[PDB]
Amino acid sequence: QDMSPRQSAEAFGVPAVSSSWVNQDGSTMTLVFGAGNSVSGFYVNNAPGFGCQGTPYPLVGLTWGNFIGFTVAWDNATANCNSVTSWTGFAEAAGSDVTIVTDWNLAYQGSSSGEIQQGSDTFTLVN
């Protein structure tokens, strides 16, 4: 009874195993549903006031039904920001549209030691 990649994507609300998304600040990501409830893809940060802008970072997560969680560690061949974000949220479908409402936490280096900042991102499915 392992959910197929296509069954996992359809339970999320999208017709295809891969799907591309944009948030309110214009960051983009692509999500790929796999076996074992897996989520893979990449994330492109375009939000102002943050580093590691404009290049893809690996993303990994899990999904069940219309719920999802995924993490991005901010290191790639181009730039490092010494930080990690996780998003968690839920998809809503309407007509031909899909939205993911998420909250996120971002661990980063504090003064003395680590801190966790928070926020919210809403992603829309790029048709």
Ligand X SMILES: O=C(O)CCCC[C@@H]1SC[C@@H]2NC(=O)N[C@@H]21
Residues that bind ligand X (CB under 6 A): 23, 25, 27, 45, 47, 50-52, 74, 81, 83, 85, 104, 106, 108, 119, 121
Contact 8, 16 (CB under 8 A): no
What minimum distance in Å lies between the beta carbon of 16 and ligand X?
Answer: 22
Residue among 122, 95, 93, 103 at smallest CA distance from 10: 93
CA distance 113 to 117: 13
89 binds its own copies (CB under 8 A): yes
Q: Are 45 and 57 spatial neighbours (Cβ–Cβ below 8 Å)? A: yes
* Subset of 16-75 contacting its own copies (CB under 8 A): 36-38, 58-75
Which strand (E) or helix (H) includes residue 4? none
Least Cβ distance, residue 95 to ligand X (angstroms): 25
Give the one entry of its own copies, ligand X, none that residue 23 binds, where binding means its C-beta sits below a cut-off of 5 to 8 angstroms depending on kind: ligand X
Non-local (6+) Cβ contacts of 7 within 8 A are: none
Q: What DSSP element (H or E) covers 9?
A: helix 5-12
Least distance to its own copies, CB of residue 37, Å:
5
87 part of the interface to its own copies, by CB under 8 A: yes
Residues that bind its own copies (CB under 8 A): 1, 36-38, 58-75, 77, 80, 82-90, 92, 101-108, 113-116, 118
